[PDB]
Amino acid sequence: NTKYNKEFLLYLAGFVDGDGSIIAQIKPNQSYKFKHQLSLTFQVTQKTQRRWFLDKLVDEIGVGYVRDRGSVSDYILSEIKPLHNFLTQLQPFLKLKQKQANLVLKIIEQLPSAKESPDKFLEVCTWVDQIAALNDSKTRKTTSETVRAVLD
Amino acid sequence: NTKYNKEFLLYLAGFVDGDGSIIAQIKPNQSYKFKHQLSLTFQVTQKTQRRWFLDKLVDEIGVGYVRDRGSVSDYILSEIKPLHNFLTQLQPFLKLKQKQANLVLKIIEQLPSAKESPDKFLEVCTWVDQIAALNDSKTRKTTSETVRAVLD
DNA sequence: TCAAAACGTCGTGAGACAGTTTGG
DNA sequence: CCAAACTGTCTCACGACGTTTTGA
Ligand SMILES: [Ca+2]
Ligand SMILES: [Ca+2]
């Protein structure tokens, strides 16, 4: 359970507030009990020419990976528990995305208990609706209401 | 000469590397002796619904202003003296824009003598070139070479 | 003759999703 | 069934300039 140097977390929070994204999604998938997956992602996007900077992030955060999508690349951290640790430490230094971080950080602490009740799952899904409304969301399709319809 | 809190600078350096810009321009303007103005800008852009964040920067930096351009707003700092003080302190924490910051600092220092020798003015425009080269420059028109064709 | 502000827009470089597959 | 990875794309929200005017 890695501890990060404060000055790193201060800079990083500023960069995240700039080019970063804290993301929650409900993914339709028949193989799941409620026919949806709950997906959490922390990401930083950057021009591939500066991919080196994302690579440095992998090294410094000690987990996650970088992916290519042409002219641009992304640092991706989706593993639920390294994510909890990282976001716990980053959260108090964020300013634009501190609300997203804390929703995520609590959606995490209720996953063990949101696959039991279909109603609990609907509750958690509404929190991801919240994260999406805090972000500059423009192409969102699957929400906690395409879900509620399905749970019927 | 205000001395800025280091935690603030660390966060700001991350945010600058993210959504900020360090700009130097050679502006054709016939009322100047060498037919161009040397202009320097530090800026941070953010969509207007987030203007409060830019307003805070005005207060915390103690100088500069926010302008609106529709859906988006920019914190703007162009005054040469505050810019020098400010960049001197920010620069050590920058990771993507450090080179640009140092070149702006160099330009500022040479500006006085730059207005006296055409050759020295050219040197400076050369440094303007390096800055544009370091940024994601895509609409640039006036270059240190446009200046030579006029120093003639 | 200047520093600085004002006014304006091109071309992405991000952000924030989607859908689908892997593998335990 | 589930976490996580893999693969793709919509629509800006930025970045990084330009030209013109103000007021000393
Ligand atoms: Ca941003
Ligand atoms: Ca950026």
Annotated domain spans of chain B = 1-152
- Which residues numbered 93-112 in B keep a CB inside 8 Å of some CB on A? 93, 95-96
**Gap between the Cα atoms of B37 and B111, Å rounded:** 11
**Gap between the Cα atoms of B144 and B37, Å rounded:** 12
What positions of A carry a catalytic annotation?
Answer: 18-19
Buried b (16+ CB within 10 A) or exposed e, B43-53: bbbbeeeebeb
Query: For tokens 């209401």, what's the residue?
Result: A145
Question: What experiment produced this structure?
Answer: X-ray
Q: Which residues in 70-109 of chain A line strand C, with CB less than 7 A from it?
A: 71-72, 74, 97
Q: Look at A11 and B16 and tell me if their CB atoms are within 8 Å.
A: no
Task: State which amino acid sits at residue A27.
Answer: K
Residue A59, chain B, CB below 8 Å: the answer is no
Comparing CA positions, the residue from B100, B103, B149, B98 lying closest to residue B124 is B103
**B118 neighbors B149 (Cβ within 8 angstroms):** no
**Gap between the Cα atoms of A85 and B135, Å rounded:** 34
CA B82 to C1' C12 (Å) is: 31
How far does B18 lie from chain A, in Å, by closest CA?
4
Comparing CA positions, the residue from A109, A111, A110 lying closest to residue A33 is A111
SS3 assignment, position B138 = coil
Closest CA to the C1' of C5: that residue is B78
Helix segments in B20-117, DSSP class H = 51-61, 80-90, 98-114
Quick one: DSSP state of residue A6? H
SS3 assignment, position A84 = helix
Residue B47, chain A, CB below 8 Å: the answer is yes
- Return the CATH architecture of domain B1-152: Roll (3.10)
B7 interaction partners in chain A (CB closer than 8 Å): 10
Buried b (16+ CB within 10 A) or exposed e, A92-119: ebbebbbbbbbbbbebbeeeeebeeebe
Instruction: Please name the residue of chain A whose CA is at the shortest distance from the CA of residue B10.
Output: A11
Structure tokens at A69: 């999508």
Q: CB atoms < 10 A from the CB of A80, how many?
A: 14
A interface test, pick of B7, B9, B10 with most A CB neighbours within 10 Å: B10
- Which residues numbered 116-135 in B keep a CB inside 8 Å of some CB on A? none
- Resolution (angstroms) stands at 2.3
**Which CB contacts under 8 angstroms, 24+ apart, belong to A137-146?**
A142/A25, A142/A26, A142/A27, A142/A28, A142/A36, A143/A26, A144/A26, A146/A26, A146/A28
